[PDB]
Amino acid sequence: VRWKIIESSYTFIDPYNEKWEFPRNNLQFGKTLGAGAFGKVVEATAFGLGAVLKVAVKMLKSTAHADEKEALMSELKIMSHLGQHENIVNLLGACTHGGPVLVITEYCCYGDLLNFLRRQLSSRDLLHFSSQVAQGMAFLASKNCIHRDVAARNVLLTNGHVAKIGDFGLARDIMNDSNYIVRLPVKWMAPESIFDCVYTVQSDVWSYGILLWEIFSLGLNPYPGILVNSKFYKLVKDGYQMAQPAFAPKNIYSIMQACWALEPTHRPTFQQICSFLQE
Numbered sequence: 001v002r003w004k005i006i007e008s009s010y011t012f013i014d015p016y017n018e019k020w021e022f023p024r025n026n027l028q029f030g031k032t033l034g035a036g037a038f039g040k041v042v043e044a045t046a047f048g049l050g051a052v053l054k055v056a057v058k059m060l061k062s063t064a065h066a067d068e069k070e071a072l073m074s075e076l077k078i079m080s081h082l083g084q085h086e087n088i089v090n091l092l093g094a095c096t097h098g099g100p101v102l103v104i105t106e107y108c109c110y111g112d113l114l115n116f117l118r119r120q121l122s123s124r125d126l127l128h129f130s131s132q133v134a135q136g137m138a139f140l141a142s143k144n145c146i147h148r149d150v151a152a153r154n155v156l157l158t159n160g161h162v163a164k165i166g167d168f169g170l171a172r173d174i175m176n177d178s179n180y181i182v183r184l185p186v187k188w189m190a191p192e193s194i195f196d197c198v199y200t201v202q203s204d205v206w207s208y209g210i211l212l213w214e215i216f217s218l219g220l221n222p223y224p225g226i227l228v229n230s231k232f233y234k235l236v237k238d239g240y241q242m243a244q245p246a247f248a249p250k251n252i253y254s255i256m257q258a259c260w261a262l263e264p265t266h267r268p269t270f271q272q273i274c275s276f277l278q279e
């Protein structure tokens, strides 16, 4: 679904600090980048932030009620508490008074990784995206935070084509995206998450392996030509794994295979992945 802080790094608190408040009159809205069922994000210019800056602003749609306004405040609260990292879309501000709740984050000018992969690209660039995402994920794991939608569509590229992850669950067009199965991104999910609804850092690691396959296939849909149905679930349960992508060095495919261990404890950690990638 969306990002979640779990217990045991140690979790002292379950996450609004008004230090983040920014005046909404100092934002000018531009184009819409995307929207979900209850949320949307627009690009904006913010004047005097922290500096005149292109930023992304997340807000509710008209269709949202108090339940959704709370999920948005709850996302703002998680973001305020995690702290900053180069490979996360960072919180910059919020407007929680004088109007609808606005959450202000870094704008990533190159858009999403999936579309970038699909549109020259070098092997070193692919390895960098892979490392950048792994670093963001190790950061989250170090904060006892689970992502639960790791996927190329959910990695953004900013200046220097540096990759960032973020919690885009409220602004993700889920209802009109057939990769979410009546709604879960099943082709990216670990078996324990499909068959037991269990979600852990290790389940995120499985999804990371799927992301790697997307990157090194240059954006193929996972499990090419295979429909999500009974046969699909039996395959993954029975240990079926996608073939090595055309642009993956064998050592990178070995990371995927490791991420896809059926036993979650036999999967690597994100720090181990970063370490191996740096080598």
Ligand SMILES: CONC(=O)c1cn(C2CCCCC2)c2nc(Nc3ccc(CCN4CCCC4)cc3)ncc2c1=O
Pocket: 032, 033, 034, 035, 041, 056, 058, 079, 089, 103, 105, 106, 107, 108, 109, 110, 111, 112, 153, 156, 166, 167, 168, 169, 171, 172, 173
């Ligand atoms: C924590 O809250 N932040 C988010 O939800 C953000 C959402 N999205 C997005 C995450 C992906 C899903 C949508 C919001 C962002 N997209 C960009 N960059 C971006 C630029 C261009 C495109 C393409 C725009 N066009 C596509 C067709 C018509 C418009 C997409 C993303 N920069 C930041 C964010 C968030 O902080």
